[PDB]
Amino acid sequence: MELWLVRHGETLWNREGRLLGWTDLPLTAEGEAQARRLKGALPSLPAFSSDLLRARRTAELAGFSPRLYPELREIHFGALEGALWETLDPRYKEALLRFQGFHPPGGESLSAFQERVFRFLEGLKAPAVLFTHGGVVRAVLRALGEDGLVPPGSAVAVDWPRRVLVRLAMDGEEATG
Template sequence: MLELWLIRHGETDWNREGRIQGQQHNPLSALGELQARRLGGRLMGERFDIVYCSDLRRAVQTAELALPGVPLTLDERLREISRGTLEGHLGAELVGEAKDVYAQMQRDLINVRPPQGENYRDLSVRAVAWLESLPARGKVAAVTHGGVIYALLHHIVGAHEGATWRFTASNAGITRLHIHNGRTTLVSVNDTAHLEPQADLRVARQPLVT
């Protein structure tokens, strides 16, 4: 059996501001660093055969704070969805063609691709390719992004494109899966119990993709 832990990075300033973050190499905020350390307390005593990590700065920083001294295998396939020329902006700041594209994305996340960016299909292809490259057994962790976690969960449960429900992936949240003989068990989704002792460690509202 393969035991897979999918872990979202801690908060960044752009997360808090609601900016379109995509594949920018933003660092963790002060809160994000604290979340990552709390995550480390939760992971203390866990032993992984391999720890994969997105090569974006916020993911690497989360992994290094939560799992100090543990070797990381960086993989670009675990990067957040690219939002191209929209990155760095608030939705409300966009004008002209960029504003139109952003509005189209809100209506059709699956197919609309921003200039120089990706759509959800593009993200799913690379995320699933990473998943299918994993060993059939062992204990694996991946420190990644909300979009990647959504894409993998939707793939695993066979969600239809028109589904009206969505998963949640909070900053520093943990999703655990058991995969055996082609069958997947969702052990936990978006577990944030390690952030509960202090209320302000949780971000009240998460954007769909960051």
């Protein structure tokens, strides 16, 4: 079934490389711009959003009035909230890269995280737009056999539970050398 997964716009931490889970950080100015670029571009389907500020704001700027669902939140990183990827315990770094067998100390296990995400998707009865987080999008895409590495402010449409249909603003920042 057609589901749109939108990764909310950039936050300071997304830019600096610090883990962001339940910390309620706001969108940067550019993050808001990324959300505004989605208005009129995404289909006018029922919208559901993570209840975290950055997700709600992305939905709003994109022109939707979503109902708020905690099940769409990013994984709770616990003690890892705000931790720099640089100095992260190698064990957690490797766990996150493979996106498997990982339980952030003090937070949610990756298994409980993915369970609430997939359970939420199974409750959908018609095409919809989901304003959520990087970890949620990655979980969904990985289940479909794809790496699930999308940039902030991007949207991906999938034929759940089969394959990707569309990639919006998926390409990264242009590179100069």
